[model samples]
Target: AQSVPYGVSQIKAPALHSQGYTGSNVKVAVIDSGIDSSHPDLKVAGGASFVPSETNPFQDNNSHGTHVAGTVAALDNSIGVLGVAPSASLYAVKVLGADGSGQYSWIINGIEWAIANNMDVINMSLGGPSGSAALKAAVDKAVASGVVVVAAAGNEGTSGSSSTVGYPAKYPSVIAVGAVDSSNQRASFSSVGPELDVMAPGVSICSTLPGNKYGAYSGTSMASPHVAGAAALILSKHPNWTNTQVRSSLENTTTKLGDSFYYGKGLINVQAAAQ
Candidate 1:
């Protein structure tokens, strides 16, 4: 990305449309802090919420989910950043709340809900350090249901030089996304391991924000949706493609980096994936 990252600059609605995937029928489910559904950029209502009965996950107190959603399905209305799948719908599954934390039960319930609704893609921008049986079961079911589960490899690069991967993404079947800077070096905070399925631009990414604001936040949380949105485009083109088949197509289309374990094929190329 340091030199000519054509995809980041040129990959947008027009490009995806050229591939016959305007993302019209694709539904990308986002499980994170709630999305600012009222944002003029996102005109439609997302599917549902997994927030506690007493609370509403409608407001994104953390702003992270809005940013992530903007990348995945921002309207093609030509206002701000156009999502990889501009015409795609977003189903908000609020797993993590305002304080940036949530119970595993919430994520488990979130995944189950997305699968039951038959969402084509589930983008998990958050995850815990450890795995839970209930969560794993939910993910397994989603996979069996043919939902593409994409999660952050996570921001915790590790403590004191020891590296660790997050749950869900660490699971073999889930597409674990790592983070890298514009220069193509691993972001200092991006978690790394053999489990990393792909890497994307996660540093200084500019996108929509809550309250009609805009700013940059760096993390795999910002990066995963780039791949997720790309996945939506792929699914839009090949609606009958299975999760593993879609996964293999994306992996095969990637531009290889010298270090596959760290960068995983290469920084995601949405334009190429659409093709």
Candidate 2:
């Protein structure tokens, strides 16, 4: 079953003459620090500068968003690193600005833009001390419109041996993801709790980095896009499936890791969902 996930980045590569998904037509609205849209290495189908016209959403001033986006869809050429769902679409929305923090208005605007464009998946790789009502409303609307919302589960999913889950991930409708090491053990940083939906390859993850490079970083941020990419796969298979249907299908098919406080519903079975 792990091969289903281990083979993910390889199974759907564009060079492998993929089923040809670019997310190109799919559109993923990334609500994070600006993305380097012009970067020759990064493939962004579209983007909105929530940071303000003064700042181009085309730079990774803070490395987090760039890596997160890479995990979701980092142009699958025969070079560098291939993304989880290279065929899926991409939409960069700069919500979290410099210092790794974005205001509520910024997130709200990003979601509005995503809805306006009918984004298939919205990746919120950035979360913080607070999940504002305004942003929640926007996400609420996005989900109601049948758009899949994938977010980080506070990096803290299995911390303290407590049931503390973070917002957005805590948000009733969104898919909250946790991290797993290569051996299927939970990453120390993964936020553990009832909020966790499933696990993904988040440890020692290598994805596109800023300035046309690739590196390893870890977090629920890394985990979020694994699910996001899987979502792309699911959407491609069942184009008519609503956001809920896609999520439920993944949840229903999950293989319970059976280790309480660790593997939530169990590990994500992408190939099972794809099949």
Candidate 3:
């Protein structure tokens, strides 16, 4: 009784999954509040807390981290929803806390750890209105070292279509992902700008949460992990590809939806990218 997340189908991840590219051997770092490792649907390989005084980063008290983790690598077994890349080695780097906010230094520490641990892909679902030089530098370094970076485009689509994209995602090296609903239309709440790299199922996305429960949440946060998991699928088959190559394949394979500022390249099609 295995479950395939609809977002997975909407993004054509099952095409790759059927090809046996379930992200095995690929390491994905979820840098968010935290994750409850005890959740049966999620299996975190390892992680650390960038937040001072926190001994364990695996406690996803806020539920956001767990949800994001599930979207990226929830187990392919029975009962729970299947992630885009169910076999990826998931790492929970707790930069944010229960309050859903974290300092820039803490985030930098998480990025540094992901790079140090040889993580193949990193998903950043958090962002701020302002930018940080240190965080940008860390992202640049991660890309230079070949770690495929992915991030949310933020939920500011209705605010105006200028440079509303948030930082880290706005950076050139990071894959800024926007949101699309089940119908493949640009989510009205998804932020847009020149930096947006792609769109994925983000509205009403169903995935795992803390306390062994499942629920629906919407945001660019939900969209970013789909792409992150998709990246893992590409890397699983093309393990020798550079980070740039992986990004290029993803951008080129998307089903064009709109101009670069609104939908970036377009809706990610993992099936096309894998072939």
Candidate 4:
């Protein structure tokens, strides 16, 4: 049997799974490096690459996107790790290159693609220190179009103060996600700010990687997909819920970890949100 990753259980996804909510047919766009669709654990419905050289969205030269994708929807088969929403349809929108860097225009174009494609949820696990007007406009456009947008809060946290949340995630329309450990304590590297919307297990998260491998990684980048998958689960059951309604349900049903700036509303409870 395939084992569930700690991060998956940490967010209580199994409860929703037992209730027959596997995010079936829910479309999720992973806007990051790219995804290794060859990985048996993942099922990429389709994708388009904004990266100039790496045109194939299925090839993940850098493992970040594949890892993030797996967290959202690795297959529930008998070998690899099970994801939060195992049956959701994944779309790889590669904005970053193999070196894990990209132009702002690439990201903007990626968001536009997801919107044009009518993706149900868009998860951006990448961010920048400074905000961009064009980028914010693209994200706003997605949310306005009724697409649920989730993003990493960035890993630039400080020991003394808040306001470290990154670009896209800092946008009011985007759901900014911070990282927590298995113990539900905020990961020290998780960015904190008034923009943060929720927390999920990110530190030492084990998920699928390129070349059909599985490994553990740590960052708020890993946390964002957990929420993306949770949104998928919620949408799987309530397909008619608007983006705002989905966001509100997730924020209001959390477990209440701590400070608003540090843990946002709190740790997400997928089962609670599904109800």
Using all chains and alpha carbons, the TM-scores for the candidates as numbered come to 0.91, 0.88, 0.98, 0.98
lDDT per residue for candidate 2 within 1-275, as digits (tens), equals: 01122424422333222555434456676788867665555677777778763267767687777888777777656666656677666667888766887777887888789888899898887666567878678889999998999888777644466755577777878888877777777787877777778777788788767787777887878888878887887777667888998888777777677664566787777667655
- On residues 1-275, what C-alpha lDDT tens digit does candidate 1 reach at each position? 11212224433335666656767888888888888878877644565666674155567888888888887777766466666777888877887777878888888888888987888889999887889888888888888999999999988774654446698999988899888777777787888777888887788887779987667788988878888888888888878888888888777777676566566676767667656
In the order shown, the candidates' Cα RMSDs to the true structure are 3.4, 3.7, 1.0, 0.9
Which has the greatest TM-score? 4
In model 1, where is the ten-residue run with the lowest total lDDT?
A: 1-10
Stronger candidate by lDDT (2 vs 4) = 4
lDDT score, candidate 3: 0.91
Lowest summed lDDT window (length 10), candidate 4: 157-166
lDDT, ranked from best to worst:
4, 3, 1, 2
Error in Å for residue 75 of model 1: 1.4
Clashing pairs in 4: none
| All candidates in order of TM-score, best leading | 4, 3, 1, 2
Give the per-residue lDDT of model 3 (tens digit) for 137-232.
Answer: 999999999999999989988555476789789999999999988888999888988889999999998999988899999999999999999999
Model 3 CA lDDT for position 61 = 67
Off by over 4 Å in 2: 1-24, 157-161, 259-261
